[PDB]
A and B are shown apart, each in its own frame.
Chain A
Amino acid sequence: PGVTVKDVNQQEFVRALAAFLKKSGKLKVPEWVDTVKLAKHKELAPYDENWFYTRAASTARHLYLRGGAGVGSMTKIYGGRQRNGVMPSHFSRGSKSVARRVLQALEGLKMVEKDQDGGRKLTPQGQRDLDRIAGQVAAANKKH
């Protein structure tokens, strides 16, 4: 028993996990979080319907890796161009309306919350919870 957050690959087990978290149905969608520009480099946006879970994925990966961060310093990792017409490129950022309202829709999910030094951080009860979902699905249908 027991699995680690950085042992195996992520796509399919988070597919199952985010499918469960989208079929929960308790998430009443904030109505001012989809019209967001986010970034210019994207010609489109995620349609997984775990899209709020996608900015949550950015927060989760880039705060587990290096703590004490928000959703703007989370990308130093795609350097090169952002050919944006007449002005030069920029470095990634994060919309804070999106963060406010994912925070308002993330109470009770025990994933992440505002830390005590700015940004986001994994909750201890939530950390136990996510290790528990990992282990339980490992024992049940994903890693047995």
Chain B
Amino acid sequence: QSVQVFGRKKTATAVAHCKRGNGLIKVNGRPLEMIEPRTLQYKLLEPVLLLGKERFAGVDIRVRVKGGGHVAQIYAIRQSISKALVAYYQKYVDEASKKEIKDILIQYDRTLLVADPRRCESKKFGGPGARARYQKSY
């Protein structure tokens, strides 16, 4: 059928349609280290220095990348590429090579599969916020 979960984190999402195609090196369709906010631009250069040029000649990952928030939209591209390699290798040859590159990527950094569960908590009685209380007079 069609198995497609793409990449997402916190709030943002990189829809990663994985199929055969050109599959050039592009982030938001843009060059290697060229992103306008200019903050976390190295995170993708690392793996492609190990395998070689032949390996990305047939992996087209068409990404709809939407979402404001750096720690969301960044750190979701790493999740997306991890899942892209995982699915490609699992479906094509065997899960041992997927085992290997997933091993290096995930044991390399824990925080792809795990997102921050922290979120703004509820405001309560008699206070300006969640924990603070109004000044008590005597």
Q: Name A residues whose Cβ lies closer than 8 Å to a Cβ of B.
A: 4, 6-9, 11, 77
**Main SS at interface, chain B:** loop
**Main SS at interface, chain A:** loop
Instruction: Give B37-65 as 1s and 0s: 1 = Cβ < 8 Å from A's Cβ atoms.
Output: 00000000000000000000000000000
Interface size class of B (residues with CB under 8 A): under 10
B68 touches A9 (CB 8 A): no
Q: Name B residues whose Cβ lies closer than 8 Å to a Cβ of A.
A: 26, 28-31, 34-36, 68
Chain B residue nearest in CB terms to A11:
B36
B135 to chain A, nearest CB (A): 24
Q: Which 4 A-B pairs have the closest CB atoms?
A: A7-B29, A9-B30, A8-B30, A8-B29
Q: How far is it, in angstroms, between the C-alpha of A4 and the C-alpha of B62 when the chains are bound?
A: 14
B residues near A8, Cβ cutoff 8 Å: 29-31
Chain A residue nearest in CB terms to B29:
A7
Chain B residue nearest in CB terms to A9:
B30
Residue from A6, A7, A9, A77 within 8 A of B36 (CB atoms):
A9
Chain B residue nearest in CB terms to A10:
B36
B residues near A7, Cβ cutoff 8 Å: 26, 29-30
A6 touches B29 (CB 8 A): yes
A11 to chain B, nearest CB (A): 7
